Amino acid sequence: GSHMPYKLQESFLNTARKKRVKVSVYLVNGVRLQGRIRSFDLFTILLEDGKQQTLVYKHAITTIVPHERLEI
Amino acid sequence: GSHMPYKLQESFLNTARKKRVKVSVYLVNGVRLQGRIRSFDLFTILLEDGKQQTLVYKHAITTIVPHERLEI
Amino acid sequence: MPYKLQESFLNTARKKRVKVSVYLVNGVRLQGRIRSFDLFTILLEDGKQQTLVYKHAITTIVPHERLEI
Amino acid sequence: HMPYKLQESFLNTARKKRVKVSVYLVNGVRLQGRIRSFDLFTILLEDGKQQTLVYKHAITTIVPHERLEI
Amino acid sequence: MPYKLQESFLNTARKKRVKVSVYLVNGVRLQGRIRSFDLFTILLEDGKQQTLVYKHAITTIVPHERLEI
Amino acid sequence: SHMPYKLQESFLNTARKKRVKVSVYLVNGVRLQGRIRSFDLFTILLEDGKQQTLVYKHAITTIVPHERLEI
Ligand SMILES: [Cl-]
Protein backbone atom coordinates (compact mmCIF):
# COMPACT_ATOMS: atom_id res chain seq x y z
CA GLY A 1 0.00 0.00 0.00
CA SER A 2 0.98 3.60 0.61
CA HIS A 3 4.05 4.77 2.51
CA MET A 4 3.52 4.59 6.29
CA PRO A 5 6.87 5.69 7.76
CA TYR A 6 5.65 5.70 11.39
CA LYS A 7 3.52 2.54 11.44
CA LEU A 8 5.71 0.61 13.90
CA GLN A 9 6.73 3.55 16.08
CA GLU A 10 3.17 4.88 16.32
CA SER A 11 1.70 1.44 17.10
CA PHE A 12 4.31 0.76 19.78
CA LEU A 13 3.86 4.12 21.52
CA ASN A 14 0.07 4.11 21.27
CA THR A 15 -0.17 0.57 22.66
CA ALA A 16 2.08 1.42 25.61
CA ARG A 17 0.04 4.58 26.17
CA LYS A 18 -3.41 2.96 25.98
CA LYS A 19 -2.43 -0.05 28.12
CA ARG A 20 -0.67 2.21 30.67
CA VAL A 21 2.43 -0.01 30.66
CA LYS A 22 5.50 1.15 32.55
CA VAL A 23 8.47 1.67 30.25
CA SER A 24 12.17 2.29 30.60
CA VAL A 25 13.40 4.98 28.20
CA TYR A 26 17.16 4.83 27.66
CA LEU A 27 18.95 7.99 26.54
CA VAL A 28 22.03 8.47 24.38
CA ASN A 29 24.09 9.36 27.47
CA GLY A 30 23.11 6.21 29.39
CA VAL A 31 20.48 7.84 31.60
CA ARG A 32 17.43 5.60 32.11
CA LEU A 33 14.04 7.25 32.57
CA GLN A 34 11.06 5.32 33.89
CA GLY A 35 7.34 5.98 33.75
CA ARG A 36 4.18 5.66 31.71
CA ILE A 37 3.66 7.32 28.34
CA ARG A 38 0.90 9.88 28.84
CA SER A 39 1.10 11.40 25.35
CA PHE A 40 3.41 11.75 22.36
CA ASP A 41 3.74 13.63 19.10
CA LEU A 42 6.15 13.58 16.17
CA PHE A 43 9.27 14.58 18.11
CA THR A 44 8.45 14.24 21.83
CA ILE A 45 7.05 11.85 24.45
CA LEU A 46 5.48 12.86 27.76
CA LEU A 47 6.48 10.46 30.56
CA GLU A 48 4.72 10.45 33.92
CA ASP A 49 6.28 8.92 37.03
CA GLY A 50 4.01 9.60 39.97
CA LYS A 51 3.44 13.34 40.15
CA GLN A 52 6.42 14.21 37.93
CA GLN A 53 6.07 15.01 34.22
CA THR A 54 9.05 14.78 31.86
CA LEU A 55 9.02 15.91 28.23
CA VAL A 56 11.48 13.65 26.38
CA TYR A 57 12.89 14.48 22.94
CA LYS A 58 12.89 11.38 20.75
CA HIS A 59 16.23 12.43 19.20
CA ALA A 60 17.83 11.70 22.62
CA ILE A 61 16.29 8.21 23.02
CA THR A 62 18.16 5.04 22.15
CA THR A 63 15.60 2.41 23.15
CA ILE A 64 12.24 2.01 24.84
CA VAL A 65 11.76 -1.19 26.83
CA PRO A 66 8.26 -2.00 28.13
CA HIS A 67 7.98 -3.65 31.53
CA GLU A 68 5.16 -5.88 30.24
CA ARG A 69 4.73 -7.46 26.84
CA LEU A 70 2.90 -5.28 24.32
CA GLU A 71 0.54 -6.90 21.84
CA ILE A 72 1.39 -4.52 19.02
CA GLY B 1 -8.61 10.26 13.22
CA SER B 2 -6.29 13.25 13.44
CA HIS B 3 -2.76 13.71 14.66
CA MET B 4 -0.99 16.99 15.27
CA PRO B 5 2.80 16.60 15.06
CA TYR B 6 3.66 19.43 17.46
CA LYS B 7 0.64 19.52 19.79
CA LEU B 8 2.36 17.96 22.80
CA GLN B 9 5.64 19.83 22.42
CA GLU B 10 3.95 23.18 21.79
CA SER B 11 1.44 22.80 24.62
CA PHE B 12 4.16 21.79 27.08
CA LEU B 13 6.50 24.67 26.17
CA ASN B 14 3.71 27.22 25.90
CA THR B 15 2.13 26.28 29.23
CA ALA B 16 5.49 26.50 31.01
CA ARG B 17 6.07 29.86 29.29
CA LYS B 18 2.68 31.36 30.14
CA LYS B 19 2.64 30.07 33.73
CA ARG B 20 6.27 31.20 34.19
CA VAL B 21 7.16 27.81 35.67
CA LYS B 22 10.81 27.11 36.42
CA VAL B 23 12.16 24.19 34.40
CA SER B 24 15.24 22.00 34.36
CA VAL B 25 16.54 21.49 30.82
CA TYR B 26 18.82 18.45 30.65
CA LEU B 27 21.36 18.30 27.83
CA VAL B 28 22.85 15.36 25.94
CA ASN B 29 26.17 15.84 27.77
CA GLY B 30 24.58 15.77 31.24
CA VAL B 31 24.58 19.53 31.84
CA ARG B 32 21.39 20.73 33.56
CA LEU B 33 20.19 24.23 32.70
CA GLN B 34 17.63 25.97 34.90
CA GLY B 35 15.35 28.91 34.25
CA ARG B 36 12.06 30.04 32.80
CA ILE B 37 11.05 29.70 29.15
CA ARG B 38 10.73 33.23 27.76
CA SER B 39 10.19 32.21 24.12
CA PHE B 40 10.69 29.33 21.70
CA ASP B 41 10.51 28.53 18.00
CA LEU B 42 10.89 25.41 15.89
CA PHE B 43 14.52 24.66 16.82
CA THR B 44 15.40 26.82 19.86
CA ILE B 45 14.24 27.80 23.35
CA LEU B 46 15.13 31.04 25.14
CA LEU B 47 15.75 30.41 28.82
CA GLU B 48 16.03 33.18 31.39
CA ASP B 49 17.63 32.82 34.82
CA GLY B 50 17.92 36.08 36.71
CA LYS B 51 19.52 38.56 34.33
CA GLN B 52 21.04 35.90 32.04
CA GLN B 53 19.58 34.77 28.72
CA THR B 54 20.55 31.44 27.18
CA LEU B 55 19.53 30.32 23.69
CA VAL B 56 19.20 26.52 23.79
CA TYR B 57 19.15 24.36 20.67
CA LYS B 58 16.46 21.71 21.03
CA HIS B 59 18.69 19.14 19.28
CA ALA B 60 20.92 19.26 22.40
CA ILE B 61 18.08 18.68 24.89
CA THR B 62 17.24 15.26 26.28
CA THR B 63 14.42 16.15 28.68
CA ILE B 64 12.59 19.10 30.20
CA VAL B 65 11.32 18.73 33.76
CA PRO B 66 9.00 21.42 35.17
CA HIS B 67 9.41 22.39 38.81
CA GLU B 68 5.61 22.66 39.13
CA ARG B 69 2.91 20.52 37.57
CA LEU B 70 1.74 21.74 34.15
CA GLU B 71 -1.97 21.48 33.36
CA ILE B 72 -1.74 20.38 29.73
CA MET C 1 16.74 4.18 -4.52
CA PRO C 2 17.59 5.76 -1.17
CA TYR C 3 16.69 2.75 1.03
CA LYS C 4 17.49 -0.18 -1.26
CA LEU C 5 20.40 -1.46 0.83
CA GLN C 6 19.01 -0.65 4.28
CA GLU C 7 15.59 -2.15 3.51
CA SER C 8 17.05 -5.27 1.88
CA PHE C 9 19.39 -5.84 4.83
CA LEU C 10 16.72 -5.36 7.51
CA ASN C 11 14.06 -7.36 5.67
CA THR C 12 16.39 -10.28 4.97
CA ALA C 13 17.44 -10.45 8.63
CA ARG C 14 13.77 -10.24 9.61
CA LYS C 15 12.50 -12.91 7.20
CA LYS C 16 15.36 -15.30 7.94
CA ARG C 17 15.04 -14.74 11.72
CA VAL C 18 18.80 -14.16 12.03
CA LYS C 19 20.16 -12.97 15.37
CA VAL C 20 21.80 -9.55 15.13
CA SER C 21 23.97 -7.36 17.32
CA VAL C 22 22.82 -3.73 17.24
CA TYR C 23 25.61 -1.41 18.41
CA LEU C 24 24.61 1.99 19.78
CA VAL C 25 26.39 5.35 19.71
CA ASN C 26 27.25 5.02 23.42
CA GLY C 27 28.84 1.57 23.05
CA VAL C 28 25.87 -0.45 24.30
CA ARG C 29 25.32 -3.66 22.30
CA LEU C 30 21.78 -4.94 21.91
CA GLN C 31 21.09 -8.48 20.73
CA GLY C 32 18.01 -10.10 19.27
CA ARG C 33 15.96 -10.72 16.16
CA ILE C 34 14.35 -8.01 14.04
CA ARG C 35 10.58 -8.43 14.32
CA SER C 36 9.60 -5.25 12.46
CA PHE C 37 10.92 -1.87 11.32
CA ASP C 38 9.74 1.41 9.84
CA LEU C 39 11.47 4.59 8.67
CA PHE C 40 12.98 5.58 12.02
CA THR C 41 12.69 2.54 14.34
CA ILE C 42 13.42 -1.18 14.59
CA LEU C 43 11.59 -3.62 16.87
CA LEU C 44 14.04 -6.10 18.39
CA GLU C 45 13.00 -9.23 20.26
CA ASP C 46 15.24 -11.16 22.66
CA GLY C 47 13.30 -14.04 24.14
CA LYS C 48 10.23 -12.51 25.75
CA GLN C 49 11.53 -8.93 25.76
CA GLN C 50 10.69 -6.35 23.11
CA THR C 51 12.86 -3.29 22.55
CA LEU C 52 11.99 -0.37 20.27
CA VAL C 53 15.28 0.98 18.91
CA TYR C 54 15.62 4.39 17.29
CA LYS C 55 17.82 4.13 14.20
CA HIS C 56 19.41 7.52 14.97
CA ALA C 57 21.10 5.83 17.97
CA ILE C 58 22.51 2.88 16.01
CA THR C 59 26.07 2.78 14.70
CA THR C 60 26.15 -0.69 13.14
CA ILE C 61 24.12 -3.87 12.79
CA VAL C 62 26.11 -7.12 12.65
CA PRO C 63 24.29 -10.35 11.73
CA HIS C 64 25.30 -13.51 13.61
CA GLU C 65 24.95 -15.51 10.37
CA ARG C 66 25.84 -14.51 6.83
CA LEU C 67 22.93 -12.79 5.10
CA GLU C 68 22.28 -13.55 1.44
CA ILE C 69 20.74 -10.12 0.91
CA HIS D 1 4.62 30.67 10.12
CA MET D 2 7.76 31.87 11.94
CA PRO D 3 9.88 28.77 12.69
CA TYR D 4 13.08 30.82 13.04
CA LYS D 5 11.73 34.02 14.62
CA LEU D 6 13.52 33.57 17.95
CA GLN D 7 16.71 32.02 16.58
CA GLU D 8 17.13 34.68 13.88
CA SER D 9 16.30 37.57 16.21
CA PHE D 10 18.78 36.32 18.82
CA LEU D 11 21.62 35.74 16.36
CA ASN D 12 20.99 38.92 14.38
CA THR D 13 20.79 41.12 17.48
CA ALA D 14 24.04 39.69 18.83
CA ARG D 15 25.61 40.23 15.40
CA LYS D 16 24.42 43.81 14.95
CA LYS D 17 25.24 44.85 18.51
CA ARG D 18 28.68 43.16 18.27
CA VAL D 19 28.07 41.47 21.64
CA LYS D 20 30.57 38.88 22.83
CA VAL D 21 29.06 35.42 23.22
CA SER D 22 29.99 32.07 24.66
CA VAL D 23 29.08 29.18 22.35
CA TYR D 24 28.94 25.88 24.24
CA LEU D 25 29.39 22.68 22.25
CA VAL D 26 27.97 19.19 22.77
CA ASN D 27 31.38 17.95 23.97
CA GLY D 28 31.76 20.67 26.63
CA VAL D 29 34.08 22.94 24.65
CA ARG D 30 33.28 26.66 25.10
CA LEU D 31 34.01 28.96 22.17
CA GLN D 32 34.10 32.72 22.63
CA GLY D 33 33.84 35.59 20.19
CA ARG D 34 31.47 37.81 18.26
CA ILE D 35 28.99 36.59 15.66
CA ARG D 36 30.16 37.98 12.32
CA SER D 37 27.59 36.10 10.22
CA PHE D 38 25.31 33.08 10.25
CA ASP D 39 23.19 31.03 7.85
CA LEU D 40 20.78 28.12 8.20
CA PHE D 41 23.32 25.62 9.53
CA THR D 42 26.44 27.58 10.55
CA ILE D 43 27.66 30.57 12.57
CA LEU D 44 30.85 32.50 11.82
CA LEU D 45 32.59 33.54 15.06
CA GLU D 46 35.44 36.04 15.27
CA ASP D 47 37.80 36.15 18.25
CA GLY D 48 40.21 38.94 17.40
CA LYS D 49 42.11 37.74 14.34
CA GLN D 50 40.81 34.16 14.28
CA GLN D 51 37.72 33.08 12.35
CA THR D 52 35.84 29.91 13.34
CA LEU D 53 32.97 28.38 11.38
CA VAL D 54 30.68 26.62 13.87
CA TYR D 55 28.08 24.03 12.89
CA LYS D 56 24.85 24.70 14.76
CA HIS D 57 24.26 20.94 15.11
CA ALA D 58 27.25 20.90 17.51
CA ILE D 59 26.01 23.78 19.68
CA THR D 60 24.09 23.26 22.90
CA THR D 61 23.68 26.88 24.06
CA ILE D 62 24.67 30.44 23.23
CA VAL D 63 25.12 32.80 26.17
CA PRO D 64 25.58 36.53 25.47
CA HIS D 65 28.00 38.48 27.65
CA GLU D 66 25.62 41.47 27.63
CA ARG D 67 21.84 41.44 27.70
CA LEU D 68 20.27 41.31 24.23
CA GLU D 69 17.23 43.55 23.79
CA ILE D 70 15.13 41.10 21.78
CA MET E 1 24.19 18.11 -6.90
CA PRO E 2 24.10 17.56 -3.13
CA TYR E 3 25.83 14.16 -3.29
CA LYS E 4 28.40 14.65 -6.06
CA LEU E 5 31.47 14.20 -3.84
CA GLN E 6 30.03 11.64 -1.42
CA GLU E 7 28.65 9.42 -4.18
CA SER E 8 31.85 9.61 -6.24
CA PHE E 9 34.02 8.78 -3.23
CA LEU E 10 31.90 5.82 -2.11
CA ASN E 11 31.40 4.47 -5.64
CA THR E 12 35.11 4.68 -6.47
CA ALA E 13 36.08 2.87 -3.27
CA ARG E 14 33.41 0.25 -3.97
CA LYS E 15 34.36 -0.35 -7.61
CA LYS E 16 38.11 -0.44 -6.93
CA ARG E 17 37.59 -2.70 -3.88
CA VAL E 18 39.86 -0.48 -1.78
CA LYS E 19 40.06 -1.22 1.93
CA VAL E 20 38.83 1.66 4.06
CA SER E 21 38.86 2.64 7.70
CA VAL E 22 35.46 3.92 8.82
CA TYR E 23 35.77 5.96 12.02
CA LEU E 24 32.70 6.33 14.23
CA VAL E 25 31.54 9.13 16.50
CA ASN E 26 32.48 7.09 19.60
CA GLY E 27 36.04 6.42 18.38
CA VAL E 28 35.47 2.87 17.14
CA ARG E 29 37.32 2.17 13.88
CA LEU E 30 35.73 -0.28 11.46
CA GLN E 31 37.76 -1.78 8.61
CA GLY E 32 36.72 -3.45 5.39
CA ARG E 33 35.62 -2.95 1.82
CA ILE E 34 32.48 -1.09 0.74
CA ARG E 35 30.20 -3.70 -0.83
CA SER E 36 27.19 -1.43 -1.25
CA PHE E 37 25.70 1.82 -0.03
CA ASP E 38 22.50 3.85 -0.20
CA LEU E 39 21.36 7.25 1.07
CA PHE E 40 21.77 6.51 4.80
CA THR E 41 23.80 3.27 5.11
CA ILE E 42 27.00 1.56 3.96
CA LEU E 43 27.55 -2.20 3.80
CA LEU E 44 31.11 -3.00 4.90
CA GLU E 45 32.65 -6.44 4.39
CA ASP E 46 35.69 -7.67 6.31
CA GLY E 47 36.33 -11.15 4.95
CA LYS E 48 33.29 -13.17 6.03
CA GLN E 49 31.61 -10.55 8.24
CA GLN E 50 29.03 -8.08 6.96
CA THR E 51 28.35 -4.87 8.89
CA LEU E 52 25.58 -2.40 8.07
CA VAL E 53 26.87 1.05 9.08
CA TYR E 54 24.61 4.06 9.53
CA LYS E 55 26.24 7.12 7.95
CA HIS E 56 24.95 9.32 10.78
CA ALA E 57 27.41 7.48 13.08
CA ILE E 58 30.45 7.98 10.81
CA THR E 59 32.96 10.78 11.31
CA THR E 60 35.44 10.01 8.54
CA ILE E 61 36.27 7.43 5.89
CA VAL E 62 39.97 6.95 5.12
CA PRO E 63 40.94 4.76 2.15
CA HIS E 64 44.04 2.61 2.50
CA GLU E 65 45.03 3.42 -1.11
CA ARG E 66 44.68 6.68 -3.00
CA LEU E 67 41.34 7.01 -4.81
CA GLU E 68 41.38 8.63 -8.24
CA ILE E 69 37.93 10.08 -7.60
CA SER F 1 29.94 40.99 5.79
CA HIS F 2 26.75 39.05 6.54
CA MET F 3 25.65 36.07 4.45
CA PRO F 4 22.34 35.01 6.05
CA TYR F 5 22.35 32.61 3.12
CA LYS F 6 25.41 30.86 1.67
CA LEU F 7 27.85 31.60 4.53
CA GLN F 8 28.83 27.93 4.75
CA GLU F 9 29.24 27.59 0.98
CA SER F 10 31.27 30.81 0.72
CA PHE F 11 33.52 29.86 3.64
CA LEU F 12 34.24 26.36 2.30
CA ASN F 13 34.71 27.55 -1.28
CA THR F 14 37.10 30.32 -0.24
CA ALA F 15 39.22 27.92 1.80
CA ARG F 16 39.16 25.50 -1.14
CA LYS F 17 40.14 27.98 -3.85
CA LYS F 18 42.82 29.64 -1.73
CA ARG F 19 44.22 26.22 -0.69
CA VAL F 20 44.29 27.31 2.97
CA LYS F 21 45.16 24.73 5.61
CA VAL F 22 42.31 24.14 8.05
CA SER F 23 41.78 22.37 11.33
CA VAL F 24 38.51 20.41 11.38
CA TYR F 25 37.37 19.62 14.92
CA LEU F 26 35.04 16.66 15.43
CA VAL F 27 32.33 16.04 18.02
CA ASN F 28 34.58 13.54 19.84
CA GLY F 29 37.53 15.94 20.18
CA VAL F 30 39.58 14.60 17.27
CA ARG F 31 41.28 17.36 15.24
CA LEU F 32 41.80 16.74 11.53
CA GLN F 33 44.18 18.87 9.48
CA GLY F 34 44.51 19.43 5.75
CA ARG F 35 43.24 21.38 2.78
CA ILE F 36 39.70 21.25 1.43
CA ARG F 37 39.89 19.59 -1.98
CA SER F 38 36.13 19.37 -2.55
CA PHE F 39 32.84 19.42 -0.69
CA ASP F 40 29.13 18.82 -1.24
CA LEU F 41 25.99 19.19 0.87
CA PHE F 42 26.94 16.65 3.55
CA THR F 43 30.67 15.91 3.14
CA ILE F 44 34.08 17.54 2.84
CA LEU F 45 37.14 15.98 1.19
CA LEU F 46 40.28 16.80 3.16
CA GLU F 47 43.77 16.22 1.82
CA ASP F 48 46.88 16.06 4.01
CA GLY F 49 49.83 15.29 1.79
CA LYS F 50 49.00 12.00 0.09
CA GLN F 51 46.11 11.04 2.39
CA GLN F 52 42.47 11.71 1.51
CA THR F 53 39.78 11.76 4.19
CA LEU F 54 36.05 12.01 3.53
CA VAL F 55 34.57 13.93 6.47
CA TYR F 56 30.85 13.94 7.28
CA LYS F 57 29.72 17.44 8.23
CA HIS F 58 27.34 16.04 10.86
CA ALA F 59 30.46 15.02 12.83
CA ILE F 60 32.19 18.44 12.62
CA THR F 61 31.97 21.00 15.40
CA THR F 62 34.15 23.78 13.97
CA ILE F 63 36.48 24.59 11.08
CA VAL F 64 39.38 26.92 11.85
CA PRO F 65 41.49 28.23 8.94
CA HIS F 66 45.21 28.57 9.53
CA GLU F 67 45.21 31.88 7.61
CA ARG F 68 42.63 34.66 7.51
CA LEU F 69 39.95 34.03 4.87
CA GLU F 70 38.62 36.95 2.84
CA ILE F 71 35.25 35.27 2.41
CL1 LIG G 1 2.86 6.21 9.10
Author numbering:
A (entry chain F), B (entry chain A): 1 to 72
C (entry chain E), E (entry chain D): 4 to 72
D (entry chain B): 3 to 72
F (entry chain C): 2 to 72
Reproduce passages from the article.
Hfq facilitates pairing between small regulatory RNAs (sRNAs) and their corresponding mRNA targets by binding both RNAs and bringing them into close proximity. Hfq homologs self-assemble into homo-hexameric rings with at least two distinct surfaces that bind RNA. An Hfq homolog has been identified in the phylogenetically deep-branching thermophile Aquifex aeolicus (Aae), but little is known about the structure and function of Hfq from basal bacterial lineages such as the Aquificae.
The apo form of Aae Hfq, refined to 1.49 Å resolution in space group P1, reveals a dodecamer comprised of two hexamers in a head-to-tail orientation. Initial Aae Hfq crystals were obtained with a crystallization reagent comprised of 0.1 M sodium cacodylate, 5%(w/v) PEG 8000, 40%(v/v) MPD; inclusion of the additive [Co(NH3)6]Cl3 at ∼10 mM in the final crystallization drop improved the specimen size and quality. These apo Aae Hfq crystals formed in space group P1, with unit-cell parameters a = 63.46, b = 66.06, c = 66.10 Å, α = 60.05, β = 83.94, γ = 77.17°. Specifically, 3663 ± 244 Å2 of SASA is occluded between the PE and DE hexamers in the PE–DE complex. The individual subunits of Aae Hfq are similar in structure, with a mean pairwise r.m.s.d. of less than ∼0.3 Å for all monomer backbone atoms.
